[PDB]
Design a protein around this ligand. Structure first.
Ligand SMILES: C[C@H]1O[C@H](O[C@H]2[C@H](O)[C@@H](O)[C@@H](O)[C@H](O)[C@@H]2O)[C@@H](N)C[C@@H]1NC(=N)C(=O)O
Ligand SMILES: [K+]
Ligand SMILES: [K+]
Ligand SMILES: [K+]
Ligand SMILES: [K+]
Ligand SMILES: [K+]
Ligand SMILES: [Mg+2]
Ligand SMILES: [Mg+2]
Ligand SMILES: [Mg+2]
Ligand SMILES: [Mg+2]
Ligand SMILES: [Mg+2]
Ligand SMILES: [Mg+2]
Ligand SMILES: [Mg+2]
Ligand SMILES: [Mg+2]
Ligand SMILES: [Mg+2]
Ligand SMILES: [Mg+2]
Ligand SMILES: [Mg+2]
Lengths: 70, 102
RNA sequence: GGUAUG
RNA sequence: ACUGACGCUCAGGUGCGAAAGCGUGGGGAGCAAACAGGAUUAGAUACCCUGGUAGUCCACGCCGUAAACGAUGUCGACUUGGAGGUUGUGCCGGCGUGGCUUCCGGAGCUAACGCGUUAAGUCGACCGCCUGGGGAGUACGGCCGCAAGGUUAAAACUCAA
């Protein structure tokens, strides 16, 4: 029943405290993203430089959830 | 007998020791500045400066983010030190730029 | 003699 | 022997108050913040080594704070014991009888640890103080201080300890 998320591709620019990340998207907007729960529990480390899939919301296009690291 | 003063005349010119400063890829600005102030102090005393950059884990897979830091230090210590060595590759998990006083 | 970091 | 309740407590007040510190002037062996150098180290603004100034000492004046602690307000009464110490004293080494004090422990008390006639027991008098953590003994104001600062003393906010 949930509304659909925009999955966009992006690059981690900086690691912030507590698994927060600046991520430049393909479109060029820099979102503040946070790690997914699945990734946190499965210990998928994210770094500066990494390629990431970011789930976004239309409600706030400055924020996103990192869902995949390539 | 007069070796005392000969020994002093030898020691009154200092042996250049190599001070090591170690950076990481994600060393933040303020912490960088502390380390740079260290290097400035070392080179103005006439010591060589083995600047190292240690990669950890998968930071290996983004070498150029490290290389940026060493390049930054070289540029900041340009009117003071001369590059006696720049790292081409990651040897082990490190990249060692020796600077030296002008 | 400082037992930096699995 | 005498006085005859003259007592206890005490907001405000007044004084005293380690060390560091401050002012003026002395003094300066040893020690030693700062500092200089030598090392150690990834770095080592340290610990270690060689030095070393203020200071530590004296006088006078200031400051007024400390884990200034028994982390335990002052005064009075009452309530089993044991072992010591110390300082009086009476009586014939012993047998008492006062003051201060260390340790153990009974009842009781206590969340427990423990306290336990020097109570944290049982009571009474008066005073001081507390009211979730952080923010904060901070800000503002007042008072005090040459200054360093001290004293009185919040709130927003945030946390679910
Ligand atoms: C000997 C060192 O001891 C202390 O650091 C210890 C560190 O060296 C390691 O053994 C462990 O991380 C310990 O848990 C730390 O406590 C710390 N006080 C710094 C000391 N080192 C130095 N002073 C020195 O190397 O120089
Ligand atoms: K009175
Ligand atoms: K002196
Ligand atoms: K018990
Ligand atoms: K509160
Ligand atoms: K004030
Ligand atoms: Mg004094
Ligand atoms: Mg003086
Ligand atoms: Mg000395
Ligand atoms: Mg010394
Ligand atoms: Mg006090
Ligand atoms: Mg005491
Ligand atoms: Mg107290
Ligand atoms: Mg009184
Ligand atoms: Mg006892
Ligand atoms: Mg109690
Ligand atoms: Mg104050």
């Amino acid at each position: 029943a949930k509304e659909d998320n925009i999955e966009m591709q992006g690059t981690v620019l900086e690691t912030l405290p507590n698994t927060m990340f600046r991520v430049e998207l393909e479109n060029g907007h820099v979102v503040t993203a946070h790690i997914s729960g699945k990734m946190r529990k499965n210990y998928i480390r994210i770094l500066t430089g990494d390629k990431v899939t970011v789930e976004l919301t239309p409600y706030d296009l400055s924020k996103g959830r990192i869902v995949f690291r390539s | 007998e007069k070796s005392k003063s000969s020994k002093e005349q030898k020691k009154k010119q200092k042996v250049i020791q190599v001070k090591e400063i170690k950076f990481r890829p994600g060393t933040d600005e303020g912490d960088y500045q502390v380390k740079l102030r260290s290097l400035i102090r070392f080179l103005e005393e006439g010591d060589k400066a083995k600047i190292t950059l240690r990669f950890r884990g998968r930071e290996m897979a983004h070498q150029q983010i490290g290389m940026e830091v060493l390049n930054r230090v070289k540029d900041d210590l340009q009117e003071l030190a001369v590059v006696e060595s720049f790292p081409t590759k990651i040897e082990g998990r490190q990249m060692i730029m020796v600077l030296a006083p002008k």
